[PDB]
Design a protein around this ligand. Structure first.
Ligand code: GUN
Ligand code: GUN
Ligand code: ZN
Ligand code: ZN
Lengths: 368, 368
């Protein structure tokens, strides 16, 4: 397999479906990436993560660099070997989570576990992601808060572009990394069309394997998010993957794919699972609700996952109310499987030229 | 399969190995029963419990009757169907955990979850175990504290024998239960040989499918426990299974089998697992210890379990220190598999007439 190859098999309007080929495997797109925080997708073995249909997972740099430490993970063989996931892993750059003394060089911060002091910069972030053995490396950026004034948004986007060039040069400086991994750049510019355009132009001039739309996971509401994607995604190179960071709910995903996004990650299916929220085609339910205490149906009556083949809402209700680990295990497996099934339906419908219809049908039912 | 058949295939001194056949499956003895507290073996799916080699699990009556409730579990189809374990389940009678107003009728108590008031008596305990659909039902007894004076020990053993007859009659009164499940009686008498003998005589006169040695899980120390088993187990009918309740550590098990015990349950491998203790043939280790932070070996280098095939001490160290659910999952799976492997080694060595040697070798290494 090549280091990185993105091929588009089918389109419908702005939506695309295709594959990214990398040394560790193929990623079907649009793709949803379960999040491993601290070298585990919470409450699942990697084989279970794979069984749900996931082709790639995300690792959080910030948490890994504090515990167990990047150098330690490298000494033990790299993140894949450490956690037992042998397919591609995308790592974030760590910047969002650090968001403290900031400067053009980078940021220094105190560990929220320890009070220990650490530093992150484009160069150190790229180095950490190398030590982890990440297949898709994210450039280090500066987070713009929402809302941001035009001047702050411009200053921060400009700094991010300077840091994107530093990230590119650090990545390219390291032979093993440049030959085996991919590097994605992140577009900033908040809600402002002109800044999004300057950011897209700067990133394309530098040149990346894929392009993320940053600065949207951050409180703006779905209508505004969709409005920003409307003009922002067409600014990115069409022939490379487009990744919307930190999104999101099933309806967010469907709308974002309609706007040309190919890759997603979110902690919702994992986190929501442990707290009692299960995704269904008829919308999310909270399994702790008393109405489920004697409900013998599965979490979702169309879902193909092993949880829905084997256990009832009533049993999972009991487990979650009782605080049992198996409750978290089953809810998380189901929610990740549901997300994978959603992406598969999205991929098939685009391939078949019926994605618009699928989106309309999906929304009608999910919100009924 | 018959309702209940215990066959002894081989003996060596007081130790026996054989099988108990029941409608839901065969139990190899000596047997270790993982404990399901609240209709789950903590942090494991039933298929994983079975994969470790377990033939039967224990359910806790006291917890189940408070949450989710016995009547509710019966309405949902019984415990097997509720939790997805289709092999035999032994339920305890609930009395140990309740141990509050006591009388010859039974005990009334306040829920430690709710302050709600509940009642337990030989008849209600047997009824609850029926509603759960238990395959091996334990007679309801009164717990004797340690230490106990001779007079208190006698009074409480005598009450337990009266309650054992009530348990027998309640069980026999219910057709579906009498035809499909088995009933075990519990010997009491604290450390006193004469009371243990009167208790054995009373229970044999009543007649049970198996006999538990009660009142030993309770603070007395291994030497005293072994001394009491020395004289107590030979008092029980030889042709029925002998169950030592709430024991225990691997060395406890080996010694107890040398004294004629066939069945064990304990929460150690589950509970100890979640707290960082892993069993090895070289003795228990606490995986949180800093010495394991870069140790690439499996938990135990002879263990055949899936955890030891796939993940390092270093990774599990990180998971447990980080408070991750997968840490509890992996430690529990390994510890239950280790216990099952220990019972298999015990069964083979008795069958092969080399159990004395195995016990000596096991102790030499485990305590080195
Ligand atoms: N690094 C980074 N991570 C994110 N997650 C959500 N939004 C962002 C972003 O703008 N930058
Ligand atoms: N019911 C009961 N359960 C136990 N668990 C440990 N010891 C005992 C006992 O003596 N009686
Ligand atoms: Zn499901
Ligand atoms: Zn093991």
């Amino acid at each position: 397999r090549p280091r990185f190859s993105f091929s588009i098999a089918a389109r419908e309007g702005k939506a695309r479906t295709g594959t990214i080929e990398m040394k560790r495997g193929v990623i079907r797109t649009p793709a949803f990436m379960p999040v491993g925080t601290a070298a585990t997708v919470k409450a699942l073995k990697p084989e279970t993560v794979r069984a749900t249909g996931a082709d790639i997972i995300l690792g959080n740099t910030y948490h890994l660099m504090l515990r167990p430490g990047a150098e330690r993970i490298a000494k033990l063989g790299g993140l894949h070997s450490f956690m037992g996931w042998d397919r591609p892993i995308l790592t974030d750059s760590g910047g969002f989570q650090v968001m403290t003394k900031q400067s053009e060089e980078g940021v220094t911060f105190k560990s929220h576990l320890d009070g220990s002091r650490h530093m992150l910069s484009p160069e150190r972030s790229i180095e950490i992601q190398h030590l982890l053995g990440s297949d898709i490396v994210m450039a280090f950026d500066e987070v713009t808060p929402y809302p941001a004034t035009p001047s702050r948004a411009a200053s921060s986007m400009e700094r991010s572009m300077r840091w994107a060039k530093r990230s590119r040069d650090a990545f390219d400086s390291r032979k093993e990394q440049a030959e085996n991994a991919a590097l994605f750049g992140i577009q900033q510019g908040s809600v402002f069309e002109n800044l999004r355009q300057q950011s897209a132009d700067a990133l394309a001039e530098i040149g990346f394997d894929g392009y993320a739309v940053g600065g949207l996971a951050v409180g703006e509401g779905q209508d505004e998010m969709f409005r920003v994607l409307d003009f922002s995604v067409p600014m990115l190179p069409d022939d490379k993957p487009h990744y919307l960071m930190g999104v999101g709910k099933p309806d967010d995903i469907v709308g974002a794919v309609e706007r040309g996004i190919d890759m997603f990650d979110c902690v919702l299916p994992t986190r929501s699972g442990r707290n009692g929220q299960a995704f269904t085609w008829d919308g999310p339910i909270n399994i702790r609700n008393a109405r489920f205490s004697e409900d013998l149906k599965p979490l979702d009556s169309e879902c193909h996952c092993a949880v829905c083949q084997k256990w009832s809402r009533a049993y999972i209700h009991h487990l979650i109310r009782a605080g049992e680990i198996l409750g978290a295990m089953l809810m998380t497996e189901h929610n990740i499987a549901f997300y994978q099934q959603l992406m598969q339906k999205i991929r098939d419908s685009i391939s078949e030229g019926r994605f618009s219809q699928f989106a309309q049908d999906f929304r009608a039912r999910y919100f009924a």
